[PDB]
Design a protein around this ligand. Sequence first.
Ligand code: CLA
Ligand code: CLA
Ligand code: CLA
Ligand code: CLA
Ligand code: CLA
Ligand code: CLA
Ligand SMILES: C=Cc1c(C)c2cc3nc(c4c5[nH]c(cc6nc(cc1[nH]2)C(C)=C6CC)c(C)c5C(=O)[C@@H]4C(=O)OC)[C@@H](CCC(=O)OC/C=C(\C)CCC[C@@H](C)CCC[C@H](C)CCCC(C)C)[C@@H]3C
Ligand SMILES: CCCCCCCCCCCCCCCCCC(=O)OC[C@H](CO[C@@H]1O[C@H](CO)[C@H](O)[C@H](O)[C@H]1O)OC(=O)CCCCCCCCCCCCCCCCC
Ligand SMILES: CC1=C(/C=C/C(C)=C/C=C/C(C)=C/C=C/C=C(C)/C=C/C=C(C)/C=C/C2=C(C)CCCC2(C)C)C(C)(C)CCC1
Ligand SMILES: CC1=C(/C=C/C(C)=C/C=C/C(C)=C/C=C/C=C(C)/C=C/C=C(C)/C=C/C2=C(C)CCCC2(C)C)C(C)(C)CCC1
Ligand SMILES: CC1=C(/C=C/C(C)=C/C=C/C(C)=C/C=C/C=C(C)/C=C/C=C(C)/C=C/C2=C(C)CCCC2(C)C)C(C)(C)CCC1
Ligand SMILES: [Cl-]
Ligand SMILES: [Fe+3]
Ligand SMILES: [Mn+2]
Lengths: 335, 112, 37, 26, 341, 34, 28, 38, 65, 77, 254, 38
Amino acid sequence: SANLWERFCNWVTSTDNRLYVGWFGVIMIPTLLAATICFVIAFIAAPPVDIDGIREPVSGSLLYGNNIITGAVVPSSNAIGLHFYPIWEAASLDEWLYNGGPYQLIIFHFLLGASCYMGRQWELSYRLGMRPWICVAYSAPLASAFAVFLIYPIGQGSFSDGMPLGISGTFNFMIVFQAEHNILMHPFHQLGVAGVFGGALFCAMHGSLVTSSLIRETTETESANYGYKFGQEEETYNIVAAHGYFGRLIFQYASFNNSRSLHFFLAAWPVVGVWFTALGISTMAFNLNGFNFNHSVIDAKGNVINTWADIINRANLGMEVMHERNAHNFPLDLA
Amino acid sequence: AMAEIQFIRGINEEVVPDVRLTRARDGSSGQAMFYFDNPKIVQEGNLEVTGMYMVDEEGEIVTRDVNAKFINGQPVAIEATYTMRSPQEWDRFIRFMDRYAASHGLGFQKSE
Amino acid sequence: MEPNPNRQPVELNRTSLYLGLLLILVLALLFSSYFFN
Amino acid sequence: METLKITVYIVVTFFVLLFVFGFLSG
Amino acid sequence: RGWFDILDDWLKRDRFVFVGWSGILLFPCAYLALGGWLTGTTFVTSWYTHGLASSYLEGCNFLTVAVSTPANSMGHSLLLLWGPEAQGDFTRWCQLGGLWTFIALHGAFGLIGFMLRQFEIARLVGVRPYNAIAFSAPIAVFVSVFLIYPLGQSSWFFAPSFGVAAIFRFLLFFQGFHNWTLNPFHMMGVAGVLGGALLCAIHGATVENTLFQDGEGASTFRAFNPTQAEETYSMVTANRFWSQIFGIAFSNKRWLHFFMLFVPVTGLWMSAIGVVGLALNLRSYDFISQEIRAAEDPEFETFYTKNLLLNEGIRAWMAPQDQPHENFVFPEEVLPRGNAL
Amino acid sequence: MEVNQLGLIATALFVLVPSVFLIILYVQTESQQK
Amino acid sequence: METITYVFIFACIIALFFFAIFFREPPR
Amino acid sequence: LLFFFGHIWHGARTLFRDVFSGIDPELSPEQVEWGFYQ
Amino acid sequence: ARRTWLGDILRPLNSEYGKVAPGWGTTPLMAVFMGLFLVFLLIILEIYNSTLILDGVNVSWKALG
Amino acid sequence: RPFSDIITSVRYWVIHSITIPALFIAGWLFVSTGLAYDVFGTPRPDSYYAQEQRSIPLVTDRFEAKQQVETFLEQLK
Amino acid sequence: GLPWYRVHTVLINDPGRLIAAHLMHTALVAGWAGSMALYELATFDPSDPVLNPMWRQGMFVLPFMARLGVTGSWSGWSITGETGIDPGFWSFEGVALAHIVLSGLLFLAACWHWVYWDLELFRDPRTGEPALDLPKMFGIHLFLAGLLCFGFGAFHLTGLFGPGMWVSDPYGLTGSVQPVAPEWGPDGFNPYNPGGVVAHHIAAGIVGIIAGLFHILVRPPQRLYKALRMGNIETVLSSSIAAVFFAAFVVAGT
Amino acid sequence: QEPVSYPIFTVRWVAVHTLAVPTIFFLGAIAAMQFIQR
Ligand code: CLA
Ligand code: CLA
Ligand code: CLA
Ligand code: CLA
Ligand code: CLA
Ligand code: CLA
Ligand SMILES: C=Cc1c(C)c2cc3nc(c4c5[nH]c(cc6nc(cc1[nH]2)C(C)=C6CC)c(C)c5C(=O)[C@@H]4C(=O)OC)[C@@H](CCC(=O)OC/C=C(\C)CCC[C@@H](C)CCC[C@H](C)CCCC(C)C)[C@@H]3C
Ligand SMILES: CCCCCCCCCCCCCCCCCC(=O)OC[C@H](CO[C@@H]1O[C@H](CO)[C@H](O)[C@H](O)[C@H]1O)OC(=O)CCCCCCCCCCCCCCCCC
Ligand SMILES: CC1=C(/C=C/C(C)=C/C=C/C(C)=C/C=C/C=C(C)/C=C/C=C(C)/C=C/C2=C(C)CCCC2(C)C)C(C)(C)CCC1
Ligand SMILES: CC1=C(/C=C/C(C)=C/C=C/C(C)=C/C=C/C=C(C)/C=C/C=C(C)/C=C/C2=C(C)CCCC2(C)C)C(C)(C)CCC1
Ligand SMILES: CC1=C(/C=C/C(C)=C/C=C/C(C)=C/C=C/C=C(C)/C=C/C=C(C)/C=C/C2=C(C)CCCC2(C)C)C(C)(C)CCC1
Ligand SMILES: [Cl-]
Ligand SMILES: [Fe+3]
Ligand SMILES: [Mn+2]
């Protein structure tokens, strides 16, 4: 009656539905469905996974005697490397599950889906006649997703060095990463931490200031829509105290006295912070490390005077000697 | 005039409010709501509200609790409130109001 | 006797209920692993 | 098992074909 | 008018910097706190309290200087300059770590003066003081870690020192001896702080792209700077957007702006509860069931069991120089190593 | 492994008691609408 | 009995998701 | 520590009673309205 | 309200309910009590923390018996 | 006065162009002649150890802290 | 309507209903103490106190009763190490039964005050609104606290009509409850000396009597009243949380 | 407002003058530390 191709093409591109489904959504839905469903089944009942290629597997499943804080989906074995490794690359299913294929399936499907999610955000904003670049803010978590699941494995040369999908898995990754690349002393993670503490601070401040200022808001509302005048009352006086202390410096730092820049600054601060730390983990995949201060101070008799950084380097040795089982004679390593 | 309302020191307001003067039980307490509808302070200027100043030649009596009403982003009216709680403040307020209501005009209404 | 006049109805809407239930279940899931240790 | 390999090629090309023949219809 | 009234109205003039009754507690204490950090991270040694160097005069750079803590034998001492340890000698007072306490205590009362300043400022303009209440999350953190925690330890020596590398050290220390990542209260802290950063980015972006006055020139003539914004965007376009992307949205601006306040603050408060719990060394260190199951079957292996081995390592290889007053000597045959399993 | 009965009851009351408080408050709120 | 508790409470969270999306209040 | 937050919140509600409420308790209930109009 | 045998006995003790004495009244006395208390708390704190020492005082489990 | 014309007045020039170098040179001389090493008790750049023993100093008492560290300082420890 | 976190904002202008609510909380606390005491007693074992003391069996409320003079059991066992004593009516069991009885009484009395919530006394005689006299109330209650502080020190602690308190030797080999006379020297602020604690109670109860008399005869100054917002019952609440959390830190520390 | 009279001893005068003289003294010292021979 309207030629099913246009009924399909109307129904998809509709902005009248409960949840938008886009042209990107047509790729987002099966990839996310695969990733989610494989993760639930795997977090419950994935068989133990040989991850080092020594034939000693690491458990990760609730039914095998874990709770959820000790569970994880365990990355693929050290024999796989960067090889593509689908189901039909195994000659039986139980060796596929033993080699940690489920992890690879999940992480590829999720990465695809995340990019489609960003794409769909751009599409609805275009459709409703909005401004774009809410997705540009969303590229900050996508960037870190990329760095920790794709870029850091390629640099190290194996998908067995990626972040496990779990609670204790994530913390194990953090500990063994600090041990070898010394990231606290790397500036890009520092710009990241600054962004996150600053984001929390500016979030708290914005909430408190606005939520005392607003008295009441109102809009007339009808039986399926909203009204004609979005009305609000806000207080509009203040003292020279706050103007001379806080106001003078936000207006000087925006280099504009418009308060339009306030929300702008609000969006920009965590995002940029998180961009730089996403750069950190990427460049550290290519074995460029953070600072190390060793024997900064020695006396004039040739005896080293310790610093507060030497205590940290001792813990780096501590963690690192436990993280090689490979030989006693590991001389110069990675990669 | 002999009575002015200023929001910034020495900046007169030309737009005259109607004032609702409500009486807290037998007069020694009460409160006045000043209503300015599209004044000139909501269309122009960048200098702040520092409080609504009622000035006469008894001095100034300053008040906080000035609000704005917005329609879709445009501020369109200013509402302000002065809450006095002693008869002293109230006879003072009535003297100011007498000099104001005469000088910007006009009558003054009462209903019981 | 004669009614108290400070008696007031209590209100709770559906969206608050959903947040509250989300809070109950999500804390319960975080702490069950320590309750069984 | 290579019927599954065959099947996966078929069913995913089918979805990217929907996506891009819709993105050219606009 | 009496002299009190004259003093009071001198303090509350409109001026560039607000003095106030609260100013009297804030400003000297803040100056001395801050300035003590500076004078100490430039000149004062720690060769006598830890066996380290930590100031510029000795050699160090910006990340590796610190004002460091006292020695372990000093107990929970106040470390007064007139106390019975210094005895009126500014040199010994610097040498014994006496000014760590100076900085800490003066900064604590500086905190108190700041929150009072927020109250009476907000009292002056006559608005609700939620920001003073928000600011008690930073006070909770400060007093639970820098004051209460070592008061549950045996000395101030196990308190964190003011400095970049010293607190990087605190991170690795807690990881090793408390396994602080596996504590539900720090997890609730992480969720809160990350959620704050999430709301911050999402709100900024949403508002900046639902602006009014995208076509003809600004029909907005005020700010009215104390309103922050909220007039400059349309609630309905953003709410309509997020109902389709994510399937739930806020329809009330006041409750959105209250959520943004609630999240980081409850976050900090919960992590404070956890660390005041670590102050009596009660530790959610291990799941009892996992330990039993690993003892009876030694082919069981978990990402968690690895973390325990790694922490054993942190402790064993960091201890002798981090606690050089204990005189740990570990022959190398007793330290733990991967190739020995 | 261990199976606490006390853990079973601890979680049971932790999820049952506040939730029933919540749904009772909702169901008696809706009957004030008419 | 422990694994049961984990999956049960998760089952409850996704049911909560469903109702909070398709059965939310009208905006009045 | 939790009771410390309690003190701060309830002191806020005491000193700022007229800000959390609409009507200053320094007035009696309001009775007859006078205006002023042009 | 009702009349009661105990209500009217306590009635004189609750019939002021808002009366102030004019001015600052007896505030200076309060001040010096508050100052003496500040000093007192510092003393007993400094005895406890053994940065103030008095002879015949050993802050130790010794001298219980 | 405001900080928007505060370093444009003849006052700024006439005083600060002499007091700035004076106290800056004072700050140089403080370190250059080694007075700081005696005021805060910083050890000289080759007095971290005695020649008597090669152990690090750590005060193991709080009320005899003063003469203990004086004993360490005696031997150049 | 009222939000779920604001359902006790109705007792604010209601003296009678508030007294009833406070009475309910008192009843619950007394009930708790009694029933916890019985629970711990049913699951205790004093056969061997030398290689399994009471804090190894994890007794929480049982030490607190033992500090101030309960030391027996109607079964006949002692925690001193003795076997075969009669502590009279006052054993651990005795005080548990006492507390349960007092919870019942308090519960009835709460119900009464909630039914008879409106009386002449609670209303201002000038307009029919709730009226409190918050300074006079503090003075009277202070006088009661002082009377109790003095009695507890002079009769119970020194054992002039009481059992006394737990005294020890520094290494915990043999301790028992005995009479303790005070110490007014500079050695009474040494917290390792029971005499100091008794002198504190004697002295502080006397200061309490005096301050309680003071606060009945003197009305607050005009400036402090209108500054600190007196006559608002929510003032007393902030102040009392402050005192209480101070007191919490000091007990945790000691 | 805030018209100018304001002689030598004012609040903003002592504010710039208790942050000025130690910062410039410390740059004087941090500078001489660079030319230590250790
Ligand atoms: C103006 C604000 C101010 C405040 C609030 C403080 C507060 C403090 N200073 Mg101080 N200080 C200040 C300015 C200030 N100072 C200035 C300008 C100087 C330079 C001259 C100093 C010099 C200084 C030194 C040298 C030291 C301190 C230290 C300390 C404290 C450390 C912890 C401790 O043991 O306290 C203990 C408590 C006290 C010291 C408080 C005593 C309180 C008094 C005098 C109350 C008297 C009340 C009243 C008058 C009595 C009336 C009685 C009458 C009716 C009979 C205490 C928190 C000490 C420190 O850091 O140790 C680690 C220390 O050694 N300060
Ligand atoms: C002291 C506090 C502290 C703080 C504040 C931080 C802060 C940070 N660290 Mg850490 N860190 C610390 C201590 C700290 N660190 C210590 C001591 C160590 C040493 C052991 C480390 C080791 C460390 C490492 C090794 C790494 C970090 C990273 C990060 C940051 C990356 C940005 C981010 O948040 O990405 C968060 C990252 C994400 C990927 C989150 C987004 C996820 C997506 C897109 C999910 C969306 C789908 C979702 C699941 C579905 C929802 C459905 C539901 C609603 C129904 C952040 C800046 C990481 C980084 O830089 O990453 C790039 C990283 O690799 N840190
Ligand atoms: C990766 C993610 C991540 C995130 C998001 C967090 C987040 C958090 N962690 Mg962390 N942590 C992590 C990973 C993470 N952690 C890991 C992997 C480790 C390794 C073990 C740690 C180790 C760790 C420790 C050891 C501690 C935390 C704590 C905290 C929290 C306390 C709040 C805070 O920031 O206080 C930060 C500090 C403040 C709020 C105080 C600031 C005070 C002020 C006002 C300074 C002002 C200075 C200024 C110059 C003055 C100017 C004056 C002038 C105007 C005159 C925060 C919830 C802390 C906590 O739980 O405390 C309760 C704590 O002690 N974490
Ligand atoms: C010391 C006694 C005390 C008293 C008498 C009150 C009384 C009041 N508080 Mg307050 N409060 C206290 C301590 C106290 N609080 C402490 C210590 C804190 C800090 C954590 C708070 C934080 C607080 C806030 C932030 C608010 C109140 C509010 C209220 C009032 C509103 C009505 C109401 O009761 O809601 C009743 C019900 C609730 C508040 C929720 C109850 C369900 C909870 C969360 C507890 C579940 C049981 C509990 C965990 C069991 C163990 C308790 C333990 C002590 C044994 C009421 C006047 C509100 C107010 O002023 O309204 C006008 C408001 O916004 N209170
Ligand atoms: C739009 C939805 C969508 C999309 C985009 C994908 C995309 C992908 N899926 Mg798939 N999948 C989907 C839906 C989808 N799937 C659904 C609904 C199911 C259930 C039936 C599956 C079941 C599924 C399985 C079982 C697996 C995947 C895997 C993969 C990929 C992983 C990345 C990789 O390493 O590729 C590497 C591949 C390339 C670089 C090129 C791929 C070339 C294509 C698609 C066609 C080959 C054509 C052939 C040579 C000539 C014509 C043959 C004729 C018979 C038609 C591939 C890109 C695999 C995976 O993750 O393995 C770990 C895997 O094993 N998917
Ligand atoms: C003859 C006169 C006399 C004498 C001999 C004493 C003797 C005593 N009084 Mg005193 N007192 C008196 C008259 C007297 N009083 C009068 C007339 C008043 C006014 C009415 C007071 C007011 C008073 C107060 C207010 C206090 C005492 C306390 C005490 C002592 C209690 C025993 C103890 O454990 O102290 C050892 C305890 C201290 C010395 C307390 C020091 C103060 C602080 C804040 C310690 C906190 C430490 C730390 C930060 C907490 C960390 C917690 C963390 C680990 C989690 C000591 C025996 C104190 C008490 O209750 O102690 C339990 C207390 O605070 N008395
Ligand atoms: C490390 C992280 C961190 C820092 C550095 C920080 C810093 C600050 N927060 C402030 C405010 C706030 N913070 C808030 C929420 C938060 N703050 C958080 C995390 C932080 N907040 C978090 C996570 C939140 C969210 C809940 C709020 C809501 C506020 C404010 O309103 C307030 C403000 O004005 O913001 C603009 C400012 C108070 C300025 C002032 O007058 O202090 C006075 C302090 C004095 C006088 C003493 C401080 C203590 C001292 C002397 C010792 C510490 C050590 C020294 C600084 C020495 C250097 C140490 C090295 C480690 C570098 C200041 C810029
Ligand atoms: C002691 C033994 C006896 C105990 C018996 C009592 C049991 C105690 C029951 C009560 C427990 C407290 C109730 C708390 C739940 C209700 C909250 C509520 O109603 O809020 C709503 C309340 C009040 O909200 C108000 O509601 C009013 C109508 O009632 C109006 O709508 C007001 O406008 C609105 O402000 O606000 C809050 O409490 C604010 C905080 C809400 C916290 C929600 C957190 C976010 C959701 C959960 C976290 C999701 C993220 C998880 C991420 C996981 C990733 C792995
Ligand atoms: C302690 C004490 C005290 C006090 C003292 C004080 C208070 C001090 C002060 C001090 C101070 C207060 C100092 C300051 C300092 C400063 C500094 C340290 C600076 C630095 C620098 C900067 C900041 C800059 C930089 C830069 C930039 C930024 C850019 C480029 C260029 C340059 C690089 C140059 C007393 C007497 C009581 C006695 C006892 C003890
Ligand atoms: C959980 C928890 C908690 C809480 C808890 C609670 C809160 C509880 C409560 C409890 C309770 C609170 C209980 C009580 C009980 C009671 C009882 C048991 C009683 C009974 C009684 C009776 C039976 C009586 C009777 C009578 C009467 C009525 C009259 C006459 C007389 C008689 C006696 C016969 C806490 C925080 C701690 C911690 C964490 C956890
Ligand atoms: C008719 C009626 C009713 C009923 C009523 C009744 C019958 C009530 C009861 C009530 C009661 C039943 C009350 C009671 C009160 C009293 C008491 C509760 C007392 C006790 C005492 C004691 C316990 C003491 C002790 C002591 C002291 C204080 C001091 C020193 C000495 C001694 C220790 C001995 C009702 C409600 C249903 C309603 C309807 C009608
Ligand atoms: Cl490992
Ligand atoms: Fe905003
Ligand atoms: Mn590796």
